[PDB]
Amino acid sequence: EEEEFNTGPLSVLTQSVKNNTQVLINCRNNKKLLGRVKAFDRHCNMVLENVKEMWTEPVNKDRYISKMFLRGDSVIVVLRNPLIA
Amino acid sequence: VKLTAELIEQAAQYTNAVRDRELDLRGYKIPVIENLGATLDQFDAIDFSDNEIRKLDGFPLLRRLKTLLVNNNRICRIGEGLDQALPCLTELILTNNSLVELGDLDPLASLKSLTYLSILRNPVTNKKHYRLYVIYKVPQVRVLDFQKVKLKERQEAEKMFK
Amino acid sequence: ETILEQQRRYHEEKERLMDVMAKEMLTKKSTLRDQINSDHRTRAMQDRYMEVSGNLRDLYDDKDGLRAEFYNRLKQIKEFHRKHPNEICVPMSLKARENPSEEAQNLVEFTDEEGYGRYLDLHDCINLKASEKLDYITYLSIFDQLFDIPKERKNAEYKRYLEMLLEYLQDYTDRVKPLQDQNELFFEKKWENGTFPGWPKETSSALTHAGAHLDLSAFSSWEELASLGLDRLKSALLALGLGGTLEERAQRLFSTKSLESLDTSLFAKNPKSKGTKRDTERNKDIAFLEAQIYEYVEILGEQRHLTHENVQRKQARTGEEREEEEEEQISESESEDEENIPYWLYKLHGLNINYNCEICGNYTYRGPKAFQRHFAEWR
Amino acid sequence: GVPIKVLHEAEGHIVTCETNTGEVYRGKLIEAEDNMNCQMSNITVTYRDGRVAQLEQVYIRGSKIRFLILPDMLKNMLKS
Amino acid sequence: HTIYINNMNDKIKKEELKRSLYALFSQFGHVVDIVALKTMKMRGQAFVIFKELGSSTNALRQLQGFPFYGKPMRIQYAKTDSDIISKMRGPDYPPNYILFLNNLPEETNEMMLSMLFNQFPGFKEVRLVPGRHDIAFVEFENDGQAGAARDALQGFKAMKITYAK
Amino acid sequence: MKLVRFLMKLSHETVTIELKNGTQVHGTITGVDVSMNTHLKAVKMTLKNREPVQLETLSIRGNNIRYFILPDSLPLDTLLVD
Amino acid sequence: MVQPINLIFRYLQNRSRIQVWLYEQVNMRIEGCIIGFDEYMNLVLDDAEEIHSKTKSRKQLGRIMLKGDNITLLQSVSN
Amino acid sequence: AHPPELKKFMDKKLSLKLNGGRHVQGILRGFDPFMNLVIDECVEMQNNIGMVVIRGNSIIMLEALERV
Amino acid sequence: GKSSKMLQHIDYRMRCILQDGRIFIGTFKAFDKHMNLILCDCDEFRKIKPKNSKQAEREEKRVLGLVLLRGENLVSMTVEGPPPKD
Amino acid sequence: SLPLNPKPFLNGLTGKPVMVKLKWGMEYKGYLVSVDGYMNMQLANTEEYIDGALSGHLGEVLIRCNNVLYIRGV
RNA sequence: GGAUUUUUGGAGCAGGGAGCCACGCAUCGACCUGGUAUUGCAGUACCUCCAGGAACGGUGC
Numbered sequence A: 001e002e003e004e005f006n007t008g009p010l011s012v013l014t015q016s017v018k019n020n021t022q023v024l025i026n027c028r029n030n031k032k033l034l035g036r037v038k039a040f041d042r043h044c045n046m047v048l049e050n051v052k053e054m055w056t057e058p059v060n061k062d063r064y065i066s067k068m069f070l071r072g073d074s075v076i077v078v079l080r081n082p083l084i085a
Numbered sequence B: 001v002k003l004t005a006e007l008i009e010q011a012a013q014y015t016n017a018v019r020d021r022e023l024d025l026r027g028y029k030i031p032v033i034e035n036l037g038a039t040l041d042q043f044d045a046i047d048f049s050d051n052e053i054r055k056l057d058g059f060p061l062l063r064r065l066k067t068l069l070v071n072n073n074r075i076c077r078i079g080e081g082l083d084q085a086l087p088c089l090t091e092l093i094l095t096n097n098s099l100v101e102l103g104d105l106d107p108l109a110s111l112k113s114l115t116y117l118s119i120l121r122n123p124v125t126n127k128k129h130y131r132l133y134v135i136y137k138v139p140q141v142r143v144l145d146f147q148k149v150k151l152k153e154r155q156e157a158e159k160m161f162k
Numbered sequence C: 001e002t003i004l005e006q007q008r009r010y011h012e013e014k015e016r017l018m019d020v021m022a023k024e025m026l027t028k029k030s031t032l033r034d035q036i037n038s039d040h041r042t043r044a045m046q047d048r049y050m051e052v053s054g055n056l057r058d059l060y061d062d063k064d065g066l067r068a069e070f071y072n073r074l075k076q077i078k079e080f081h082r083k084h085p086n087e088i089c090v091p092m093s094l095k096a097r098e099n100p101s102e103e104a105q106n107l108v109e110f111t112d113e114e115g116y117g118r119y120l121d122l123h124d125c126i127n128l129k130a131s132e133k134l135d136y137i138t139y140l141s142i143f144d145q146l147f148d149i150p151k152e153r154k155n156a157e158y159k160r161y162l163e164m165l166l167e168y169l170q171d172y173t174d175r176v177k178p179l180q181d182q183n184e185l186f187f188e189k190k191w192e193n194g195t196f197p198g199w200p201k202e203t204s205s206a207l208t209h210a211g212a213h214l215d216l217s218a219f220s221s222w223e224e225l226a227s228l229g230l231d232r233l234k235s236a237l238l239a240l241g242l243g244g245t246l247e248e249r250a251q252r253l254f255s256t257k258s259l260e261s262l263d264t265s266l267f268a269k270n271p272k273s274k275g276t277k278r279d280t281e282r283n284k285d286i287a288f289l290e291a292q293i294y295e296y297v298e299i300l301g302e303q304r305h306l307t308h309e310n311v312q313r314k315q316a317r318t319g320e321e322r323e324e325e326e327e328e329q330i331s332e333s334e335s336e337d338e339e340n341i342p343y344w345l346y347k348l349h350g351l352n353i354n355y356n357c358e359i360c361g362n363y364t365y366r367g368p369k370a371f372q373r374h375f376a377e378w379r
Numbered sequence D: 001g002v003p004i005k006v007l008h009e010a011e012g013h014i015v016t017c018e019t020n021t022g023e024v025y026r027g028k029l030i031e032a033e034d035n036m037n038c039q040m041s042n043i044t045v046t047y048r049d050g051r052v053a054q055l056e057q058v059y060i061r062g063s064k065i066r067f068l069i070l071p072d073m074l075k076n077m078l079k080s
Numbered sequence E: 001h002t003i004y005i006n007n008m009n010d011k012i013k014k015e016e017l018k019r020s021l022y023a024l025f026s027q028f029g030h031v032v033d034i035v036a037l038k039t040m041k042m043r044g045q046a047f048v049i050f051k052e053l054g055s056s057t058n059a060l061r062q063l064q065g066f067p068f069y070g071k072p073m074r075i076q077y078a079k080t081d082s083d084i085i086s087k088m089r090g091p092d093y094p095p096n097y098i099l100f101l102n103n104l105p106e107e108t109n110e111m112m113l114s115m116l117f118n119q120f121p122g123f124k125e126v127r128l129v130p131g132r133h134d135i136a137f138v139e140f141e142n143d144g145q146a147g148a149a150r151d152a153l154q155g156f157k158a159m160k161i162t163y164a165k
Numbered sequence F: 001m002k003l004v005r006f007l008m009k010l011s012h013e014t015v016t017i018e019l020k021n022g023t024q025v026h027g028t029i030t031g032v033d034v035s036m037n038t039h040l041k042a043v044k045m046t047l048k049n050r051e052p053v054q055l056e057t058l059s060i061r062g063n064n065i066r067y068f069i070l071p072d073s074l075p076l077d078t079l080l081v082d
Numbered sequence G: 001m002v003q004p005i006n007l008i009f010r011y012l013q014n015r016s017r018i019q020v021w022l023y024e025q026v027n028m029r030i031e032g033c034i035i036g037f038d039e040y041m042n043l044v045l046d047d048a049e050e051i052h053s054k055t056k057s058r059k060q061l062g063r064i065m066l067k068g069d070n071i072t073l074l075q076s077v078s079n
Numbered sequence H: 001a002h003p004p005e006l007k008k009f010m011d012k013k014l015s016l017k018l019n020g021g022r023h024v025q026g027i028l029r030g031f032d033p034f035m036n037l038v039i040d041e042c043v044e045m046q047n048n049i050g051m052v053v054i055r056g057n058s059i060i061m062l063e064a065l066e067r068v
Numbered sequence I: 001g002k003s004s005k006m007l008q009h010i011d012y013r014m015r016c017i018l019q020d021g022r023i024f025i026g027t028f029k030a031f032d033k034h035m036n037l038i039l040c041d042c043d044e045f046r047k048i049k050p051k052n053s054k055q056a057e058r059e060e061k062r063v064l065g066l067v068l069l070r071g072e073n074l075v076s077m078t079v080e081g082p083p084p085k086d
Numbered sequence J: 001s002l003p004l005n006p007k008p009f010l011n012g013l014t015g016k017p018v019m020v021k022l023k024w025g026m027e028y029k030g031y032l033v034s035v036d037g038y039m040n041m042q043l044a045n046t047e048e049y050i051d052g053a054l055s056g057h058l059g060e061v062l063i064r065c066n067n068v069l070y071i072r073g074v
Numbered sequence K: 001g002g003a004u005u006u007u008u009g010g011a012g013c014a015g016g017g018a019g020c021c022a023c024g025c026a027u028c029g030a031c032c033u034g035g036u037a038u039u040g041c042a043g044u045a046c047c048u049c050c051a052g053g054a055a056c057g058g059u060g061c
Helices: A002-007 A011-019 B005-009 B102-110 B130-137 B151-159 C003-027 C030-040 C051-056 C069-092 C115-121 C159-169 C176-184 C201-221 C227-240 C264-268 C274-282 C284-299 C301-315 C319-333 C343-349 C368-374 D002-009 E014-026 E053-062 E083-089 E110-118 E143-152 F003-008 G004-014 J006-013
Strands: A022-027 A032-040 A046-056 A060-070 A075-080 B013-015 B021-024 B045-047 B067-069 B091-093 B116-118 D014-019 D024-032 D038-046 D052-060 D065-070 E002-006 E031-035 E046-050 E074-077 E098-102 E123-127 E135-140 F014-019 F024-032 F038-046 F053-060 F065-069 G017-022 G025-037 G043-052 G057-066 G071-077 H013-018 H022-031 H037-044 H047-054 H059-064 I013-018 I023-030 I037-045 I061-069 I074-081 J017-022 J027-035 J041-050 J053-063 J068-073
Touching: A002 A011, A011 A022, A011 A032, A011 A075, A011 J053, A032 F003, A046 F003, A060 F003, B013 D038, B013 D052, B091 E014, B102 B130, B116 E014, B130 B151, C003 C030, C003 C069, C003 C115, C030 C051, C030 C069, C159 C176, C159 C201, C159 F053, C159 I013, C159 I074, C176 C301, C201 C284, C201 F053, C227 C284, C274 C284, C284 C301, C301 C319, D002 D065, D002 I023, D002 I037, D002 I061, D014 D038, D024 D052, E002 E053, E014 E031, E014 E046, E031 E083, E046 E053, E053 E074, E053 E143, E074 E143, E098 E143, E110 E123, E110 E135, E110 E143, E135 E143, F003 F024, F024 F053, G004 G025, G004 G071, G004 H037, G004 H047, G017 G043, G025 G057, G025 J006, G043 J006, G057 J006, H013 H037, H022 H047, I013 I037, I023 I061, J006 J027, J006 J068, J017 J041, J027 J053
Parallel strands: B021 B045, B045 B067, B067 B091, B091 B116
Antiparallel strands: A022 A032, A022 A075, A032 A046, A046 A060, A060 F065, A075 J053, B013 B021, D014 D024, D014 D065, D024 D038, D038 D052, D052 H059, D065 I061, E002 E046, E002 E074, E031 E046, E098 E135, E123 E135, F014 F024, F014 F065, F024 F038, F038 F053, F053 I074, G017 G025, G017 G071, G025 G043, G043 G057, G057 J068, G071 H047, H013 H022, H013 H059, H022 H037, H037 H047, I013 I023, I013 I074, I023 I037, I037 I061, J017 J027, J017 J068, J027 J041, J041 J053
């Protein structure tokens, strides 16, 4: 199982937790959560730090959330990048 | 043989040939329509054929009742608050009953959804202008005595009685 | 149709009903007495019988046996009075025929069913004597109106409302008994010493639900009294008095705006102000419901006390005691309203061996000799 | 599940069923499966527009049921 | 138990036709079901099924040529038994077209039975006339019509009419 | 690993939860179970496009949760130990 | 009795061109030749097409693996 | 891993209500534990589509057009 | 640990919120793994959950009776009132 | 081909340029790095095509399995 | 213990404008006037054709 977290597509999350790097999460709510992965699981539940939530309403909006838990079903996409840099 | 909840509770209940929920009240010699509360408004129509009812009256509020088959009874009068207890009454079959005067058919004007009406084999049928009278006083009817109410009859009934 | 005959039949049926509920009031005077007593405290004018009569359960000379049944018959009489009111309403609203009466001469039928089917349609008591209920109200069931904890008007179940209340106060410092202590507040206390702030949402909602309950319970437990009369009485008291009905020699006149007023003058010129308009326009239903809770709880003081007592009792019970008591309440609830060695010997002989006859109730027989005897039997 | 046992108890009784799409089916429950699959007969169906129809025989998948109304004859499983 | 109707105004929509048919025919007994299609083959026709057989015979005699939606309907006994009847229920000549028996007197007569038998296009043989006026021999071109007449007066309060089985 | 276990440790914390249907819930956790079914007390709940309502108790089916906003103070590194 | 999975196995063997009804999307359907499939009804389609029922327009796809999540219905087409 | 109780409906004509407000009619030829169906002589409500597979997932309701 | 969080509210009157946004109020008598619920003397509300709305508290109320709700379509529950004694 | 199944097809397509359509109509073109048992998907040098038009150049991306409609090699 | 009947989502998003009244686009269905064809023994997606009418109904954006 660890092997599948380590080398499979979830290695994106595994890599973000290890390097304390930022990732953008496109989300079902049409919102995007930008931050660092403290923890994750099979379902893509996550505990996130320094989250910048961004969305649109046209008007763009954002808000800072230091500490939060995301239920993984809401995940559409998870992006790793030269974002943290 | 009074109409009863006990009577209603043992009565044949089924889905009829035109796909509606029907209660079979036929041939009990019922004289007065009463205690319909016990059907719990669960029927599309009620078959009251071959009984001894004198007046089409006594109904509780029944929102689902759409068809009333009242063949071979002794109906001589129609109650006045029928739309208040039967709002969606769409079909009324009164064949072979005792309605004698055109004015006795007046209470049917208040049944806003009434579309199929049958009054054959009633003395009232032979009264002069019986068809035109029904058409003008109960314009919501589309089929009268199994014949289409046509425009020309409506106009003709608009002249007479205007 | 000759109206004379119809109006006749009407007056006759009315007579029949009066006679029925009169026969009832006769067998068990309590039916009226009970009712009347309550009526006494709602419409003060009402004249009530001699106490002796009430106690001895007698109407003239004969003392009748003391009787769920009282309430039952009261609801039956209720529907009877409904019928009567209807008939009274519709009622308020020769050779030619004798010739047509000759129609269908040849019928071999006995006709003894006009006054007998009615008289019968409204009388006491099954085949002979099993159910007091008349054919008129044969499907009348009190248990569909009263819960088991209410015991047909003996108590009112307020535990549920104690729950909701805990949910309202957002704590648990409140016990069933302290909750009842709260209810007691309900002419001035419930207004000037409120459990919670009377502008609190949760509170007003609760009060609504509770009020509704108390009222329905009230009329439920006293079918015989004219509900509409009581309703209108209360409403008129609300409109005509509840006009600065609360007066203090010190603070003046209180308004259900929750403020006092120096004199009646400033009080009147405050009833047109934008503030009072706003409030009376938003909190009207609640104020009225509060008031109803008040007056209905007053009319039920005896039941309130009776229940509080019950609570304290059950509370001071043990386990076995509480259990047996519950058993009693249950029985009262679901009761008719009217009471009427050779071990090798059996193997050797072939018995105590499992066998079955299908035609008889899929019955079991323990022996082959016995089953062979089944072939000649009554059943 | 406890509710499932109570559902099976309603087999042979008249019940009402609303689907996930809000069509309302009333009639006799013939068979109820563990997953809430429901076979019924002599139905009255009331659509979202209000109109009624009549059906002899139906079978609805458990997942696509929002809820069921059962008789009150059952109410009297109080152990749980 | 089933009557076959033809010569019906085929412009009426199918569900309306069936509902008026049900209404009209309810006066004689419970109608179990109605089969009517608008195909080229079946348009203008309908099969009306009754629980009771006496009801079918009464319907046939009383509504022969009844104006329905503008046209005079033609009614006849169906050729076969309806599937619904066969399922609800569960010799080689039967159904036969010659019904001979007696138990129908009372000033009854040959022009009487001849007009009652006449009602039917099958009107072929009619023997009711001696001092008897109580022995009826009816030869009806075909059993649909013999069955129609027989089903029409199938309980002449009880007469005895016995097909030539 | 199984992060529901982490949430199960948050009894007596106050949190804000955003629901899948947009509703916002602020209250004190009395219990999270294995299905993430969450129970709270002293709850101010604001359905999307209403003013808040206060409830002494509220019980959420786990699947209907979008996300939890946790106390800034929360010592995550402690809670992530098993 | 024909089992649904077997029907598919038949579609596979036949190389009949297949048209798929998708879940909660009526305006588009998918077409192709089933080359293989798995326990989840995930399909490998060849020379596949998006079919726009509204626009009468076809989008050319080639080698497609469609998740079974989307499958409402499976039909065969002569083309 | 139960079967749906559908043997009663085998080789009968049926009316199938599917999600998306979609409706088809045809003869039941078989099924599996997921309630996936084989329907023969199927018609989209009308155009004839032949023998088809309906995934049980997207089956809202079925109604028999026959007597079982 | 305790499993009680549902069992506590059993027998109580409960306000249940559905996924379409309906309000079901009934006596909470049973539940299960999926949160399929058994609700006695259950009514449905659509427009409001009253907190003493001065105009009226009740619009589009429907009496349902004995209700089994599937857990799929349940969102949440709060305590509405105490158990009826009966 | 002689039966070509989902799983092998996807495995053959690892190391390759792919495009994934999601149920929601977004499209993502990139090199398929890997897939897992649940058919979650990892792209590199991802690009986003919405309305079939290049929207955003995104880099390395995880796509949750339930979102996927279909995958195409390209 | 995230792969069709429940708890790791098929959801997400789109309505005001004009003077109490009225409304864009696409698909399907009865449907309503005239006239016209068929006289056929069935168990049914629908059911003649020709011309005119839709201030009709449902679904999606």
